[model samples]
Target: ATVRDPAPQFSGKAVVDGAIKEINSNDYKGKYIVLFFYPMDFTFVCPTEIIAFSDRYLEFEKLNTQVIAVSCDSEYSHLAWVNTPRKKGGLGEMKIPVLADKSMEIARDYGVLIESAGIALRGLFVIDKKGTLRHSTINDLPVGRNVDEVLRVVEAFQYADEN
Candidate 1:
């Protein structure tokens, strides 16, 4: 999705607070949404980015935002990864909900799904409280995203909205 447009709506099972639960994009209404899509679970680069966002989750929450990580992996895989220790490449305990887009429908709507690869690119989209997409970035498989930059932009948008 592009800036100024409404983000695609989605709902599916996710690993929330270490448990499997249902999550809907609409559930985050009136809150800034940090919706990111990684390639898959149990891979390099993805965990680092996810963990970075998780580590700073409170900062995002203080800004009235919700962070959701999406991947084409199944909910079970997400749980397995979360169950693993960080030192061993598992996400351990995350403060954000990791959405499982097993059907790839959510990724396709965001235009990041690679049908052939059976995964998604490192795609990140920020939606404002009103549900309009404010920022987006998609990186290649090998590259990782910057959590600080995302925080800065989210802050900028909140600033712009207030002023």
Candidate 2:
């Protein structure tokens, strides 16, 4: 979705902390959403970034935000990937939900899909409780995102809300 515009709404199956569950875009209406997209499930670079977000989850939760990561992989694939250990090249139990974009609908709608490669880019978005997309950062396949800056923006938003 474009910045300053309302983020797209979606409902799909996702692997949340290794459980297959139904997730709706409206589920996050009362909280900020860190809606991120990664290239693929079983690959390098992605695991490192996934774990980093999982590791920093408490920070996001403290800000009253929820992190939802997405990939073109199926929810089953996401479940498989998270249960795999890092040494085995798996995400290893991420603290957040990982949405399955197997149909690629949300990825395409989010503008992160790579049509030629049939995958998603390393895309990160900060959507506030009101569903307005305030920030977006997209990177090529080999690159990952910086969550520290993500937190900074979250902090900025919180500060702005206070004033």
Say which candidate scores most in lDDT: 1
Supply candidate 1's per-residue lDDT for 87. Answer: 93
Per-residue lDDT tens digits for candidate 2, residues 51-102, read 8898999999999999998878789888998888889878887899999898
- lDDT per residue as tens, model 1, 42-109: 25654777888999999998999999999778899999989999898788998999998888989999
**lDDT of all predictions:** 0.88, 0.86
lDDT of 1: 0.88
Judged by whole-model lDDT over C-alpha atoms, candidate 2 comes out at 0.86
Error (Å) of candidate 1 at residue 109 is 0.5
* Model 1 residue 158 distance off true place after TM-score fit, in angstroms: 0.7
Candidate 1: stretches off by over 4 Å: 41-46
